Amino acid sequence: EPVKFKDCGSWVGVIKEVNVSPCPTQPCKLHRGQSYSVNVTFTSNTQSQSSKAVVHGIVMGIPVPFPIPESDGCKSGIRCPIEKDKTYNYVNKLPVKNEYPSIKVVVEWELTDDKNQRFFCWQIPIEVEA
Numbered sequence: 001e002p003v004k005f006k007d008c009g010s011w012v013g014v015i016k017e018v019n020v021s022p023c024p025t026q027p028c029k030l031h032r033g034q035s036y037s038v039n040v041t042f043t044s045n046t047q048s049q050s051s052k053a054v055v056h057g058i059v060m061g062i063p064v065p066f067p068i069p070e071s072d073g074c075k076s077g078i079r080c081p082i083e084k085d086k087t088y089n090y091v092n093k094l095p096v097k098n099e100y101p102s103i104k105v106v107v108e109w110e111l112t113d114d115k116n117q118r119f120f121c122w123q124i125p126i127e128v129e130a
Ligand SMILES: *[C@@H]1O[C@H](CO)[C@@H](O)[C@H](O)[C@H]1NC(C)=O
Pocket: 039, 041, 089, 091
């Protein structure tokens, strides 16, 4: 479902929608061993041959890297090369892992371009359930 989020630095892209499922109301919650489906609609303001995603869980203000199944944006629903003013749908999953403490965690998701600049950066709170 479309979720409310905080933009943490979208620089060469413009976010149109952050859709995380299951998340009808917030904070999203999901148990360890299950994965969220993520679909980010954004419009690029630059051309780029490549794109790379990176996710962090900010736990009590401390960032921790959060692995995803595929980090190449061009293999995540985006047909590269990325073009200026074109709209894309970045799609991936976020597994909730046993290593994550079962408390509120802020998830930060980013996608960068050839120049390592942020197409998008957004944050949302999630509750990790054991
Ligand atoms: C991603 O969201 C768009 C709506 O912006 C929809 O057309 C598309 O099917 C969704 N993609 C998948 C793979 O979830």
